[PDB]
Structures are given as structure tokens and as C-alpha cells.
Amino acid sequence: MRLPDPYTNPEYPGLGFESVNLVDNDPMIRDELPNGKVKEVKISAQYWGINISYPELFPDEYAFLDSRLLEYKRTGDYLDVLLPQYEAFRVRGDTKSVTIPAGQKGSQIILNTNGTLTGQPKAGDLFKLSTHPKVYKITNFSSSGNVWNISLYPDLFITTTGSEKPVFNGILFRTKLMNGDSFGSTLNNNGTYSGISLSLRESL
Amino acid sequence: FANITNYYTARSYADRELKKSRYSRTLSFSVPYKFIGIEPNDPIAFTYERYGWKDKFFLVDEVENTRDGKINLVLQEYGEDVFINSEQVDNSGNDIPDISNNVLPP
């Protein structure tokens, strides 16, 4: 399920994201030895945290947003969040004729584009596999012919089976709405709803 | 001693315990994930320059392993003299058989 944004629903301009906050949550056990050497240990997973802020909402905008959020809380679905700043179209073509060799469980994807894709991905972009909902950021990219060497920040959450297909454009965050236990919005005497905030967390 | 019946072995063990009682001083500290494999009763040489310690002999007494790669240790001070055996004498002539509990013949 997609969170309402002024792409799908421009008739409600108040539903735009006044300010997004992409939080990097990678819990680690960091210990500082007296000999000046700082040591880290990583066990848990990394999850992208998204915080959405909203302006004053008119009754119709709030009605639409609240209906969507209640539909989410009813069906227990997953809110999809689209960040416009990450929607630069660089890689274009078909992602079905590209092959990803299997057995890749590290933090690096080696894929043979088979000359079917034009353009090259840029570092810091958003990358995602077609069979897993986790979202990756490209930290480095080296192309030697048709084989690409894409480096990802989160260690690969799945081991490639050879059937996965890279996804570069149209990437959505399969988030789950936090702070929904006590979710409310005050209605002022002037008819507009205020104090609406969405603390979302990537529940892959 | 319950399980010891040899007089000289029991005397040696008592001497060892008496020597070992003179080293009553314990030390506790934590080490990183490296040094993994420490177990109780292992020889460790401690060296803390602030004290007058340079390769001081210790034996592991308590070891605790955590899942976040930290090992808590408690060392027990020992000495070299604990394991050398002092000369003893023979008690061979001080045996007392129980020749009682029976009627002596005429």
C-alpha cells in the first residue's frame, strides 16, 4: 500500500512531505579500550528510518490521509514511501535479461548487464533487488565492460539465487508505521488539523 | 583427607596446601574478544608497570564469556615454591597394628 503523496494525489497538496528524515539505524556494540583503539561489533540488522512531517491539513486532506492510515491499520499491510530526491532516472532498459550470479552473500553485487541497460548508476543512489524488500544504497560502482560491480551499504540480507533482478528506478520503502499505538491529531477551532507526524520504520 | 591412604602422599599434599595458603591475593579484570580460550587453572603472567609487577604468576580462577565478545576474569596469585616438594622423613616404625579384640592363647 502506497502512502499518499502529491505524485498520485496532487489534489491534496497538504499531503506533501514538508521534511523527510532518512535515519541510518545500524545498532553496534562499540567498546573503547584504554590503549586508544576503538572496537565495534555488529550483530543486529540495519533498517532505514523515515520520519515524515506535515503542515496544517484541511478536512478533506486529513480525511483522505486518515482513511488510508486506518486502512493500513485494518489490513495490517505495509506502507510504501517514495522519496522524490532519490528518483533520478539513470539506468534505463529491461531488467529481465540481466543476470546476477548466485551465491553472493557479502556486501557487493556483481551482475552482467548483457548490454541491455543504458547509462550507469551513480554512487549514493538507491538500489534494490526484485525478490527482497530491503533497500540498498550504492556506495561505489565500477564497470568493466558489461559486468557491473555495485557496492551496497547494508550487507546483503539474502543470498542471491540467480533469479533476482536489480531494480534501480521506482524504489519504495516497505515501511511499517511506528508510534501508531498513540496516534492522534488535534482539530483547531479554525477547521484545520495540526500535529500530524509519521514515524516510519523499514519492516522488511 | 578421605581418598588418600599413603602417609607420605598425604604429608606432601598437606605441605602443598600450607604453601598455597601463603598466597591469598586475587585479581579481577576484563579482556577483549581476543585471548579467547582462557580457562580456569591456566598460567598467566601479569605485568602492570605502575606496581612492582613484571610477569607475575597467576592462575585463572573465574572466567565468564559474554556474547558481545568480552571476557571477565578473576586471577588467583600463586608461587613457584608451591610446586616444589620439601624433604621428609620415614614414619615406617610408627605403625600400630590392632592386635587386640581377640583372646590370647595360654
Side-chain angles (χ1 to χ4, degrees):
Chain A
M1 183 177 177
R2 274 201 51 141
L3 186 68
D5 56 28
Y7 273 29
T8 72
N9 302 106
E11 73 261 5
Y12 311 125
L15 291 195
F17 305 162
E18 201 196 80
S19 296
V20 294
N21 195 28
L22 201 54
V23 173
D24 180 20
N25 291 302
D26 57 345
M28 301 205 198
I29 310 168
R30 177 175 296 102
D31 292 318
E32 293 148 25
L33 301 189
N35 58 66
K37 184 182 285 289
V38 54
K39 315 182 61 53
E40 298 153 333
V41 165
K42 179 175 186 52
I43 308 177
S44 291
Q46 186 276 338
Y47 52 99
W48 293 113
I50 304 166
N51 297 338
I52 312 284
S53 68
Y54 280 111
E56 291 161 345
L57 283 197
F58 280 108
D60 54 305
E61 300 171 354
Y62 175 72
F64 188 67
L65 171 77
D66 186 74
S67 77
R68 295 297 220 96
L69 287 191
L70 289 175
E71 185 59 84
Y72 154 69
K73 296 171 84 164
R74 202 205 93 225
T75 51
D77 291 331
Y78 294 108
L79 288 184
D80 291 331
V81 179
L82 184 134
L83 313 181
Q85 75 263 25
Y86 283 118
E87 276 311 322
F89 302 85
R90 274 73 172 269
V91 176
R92 283 211 207 71
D94 274 353
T95 59
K96 293 166 132 62
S97 51
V98 65
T99 66
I100 302 187
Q104 297 195 140
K105 38 183 172 293
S107 61
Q108 171 181 174
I109 290 294
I110 297 169
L111 62 93
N112 179 33
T113 199
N114 195 9
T116 198
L117 288 168
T118 185
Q120 292 180 5
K122 190 186 272 181
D125 272 22
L126 279 187
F127 163 88
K128 185 171 85 168
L129 296 167
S130 55
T131 80
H132 205 58
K134 183 62 174 66
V135 193
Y136 296 151
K137 308 198 82 166
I138 302 183
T139 71
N140 194 300
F141 166 77
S142 66
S143 172
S144 65
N146 276 343
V147 296
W148 290 1
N149 205 72
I150 303 180
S151 312
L152 321 166
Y153 164 67
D155 303 88
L156 287 165
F157 276 66
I158 55 151
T159 286
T160 48
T161 56
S163 186
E164 301 76 10
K165 296 309 183 191
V167 174
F168 302 99
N169 55 346
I171 293 186
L172 300 160
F173 291 76
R174 185 155 160 262
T175 59
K176 170 158 299 310
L177 169 74
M178 308 275 94
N179 82 16
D181 46 356
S182 177
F183 190 76
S185 54
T186 175
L187 165 61
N188 264 267
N189 48 359
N190 53 18
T192 62
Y193 300 75
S194 183
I196 310 194
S197 180
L198 298 197
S199 307
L200 305 149
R201 176 212 190 281
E202 188 193 9
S203 178
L204 61 84
Chain B
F1 307 129
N3 304 330
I4 310 187
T5 57
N6 194 3
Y7 173 90
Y8 314 105
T9 300
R11 161 94 191 260
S12 293
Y13 196 89
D15 200 352
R16 170 150 65 169
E17 293 291 331
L18 182 62
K19 294 173 174 171
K20 189 167 49 68
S21 89
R22 308 292 299 181
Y23 296 101
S24 296
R25 177 184 302 171
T26 187
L27 183 63
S28 81
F29 58 89
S30 293
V31 293
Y33 181 58
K34 171 194 55 185
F35 304 123
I36 188 66
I38 297 169
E39 297 221 335
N41 278 330
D42 276 354
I44 281 164
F46 204 70
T47 298
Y48 183 43
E49 183 178 1
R50 182 161 167 262
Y51 310 156
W53 286 3
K54 183 170 72 71
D55 298 12
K56 201 186 158 33
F57 191 64
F58 278 92
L59 278 190
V60 188
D61 187 56
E62 301 214 19
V63 55
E64 172 158 30
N65 276 128
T66 66
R67 189 266 183 276
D68 63 358
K70 173 158 81 212
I71 310 170
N72 311 344
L73 298 166
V74 171
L75 299 192
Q76 174 88 33
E77 192 198 357
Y78 274 71
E80 188 174 19
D81 62 319
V82 183
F83 307 104
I84 65 177
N85 303 124
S86 177
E87 183 67 23
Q88 55 183 352
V89 287
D90 49 357
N91 204 66
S92 65
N94 308 341
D95 64 320
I96 317 161
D98 186 74
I99 62 170
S100 187
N101 294 56
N102 61 282
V103 183
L104 299 182

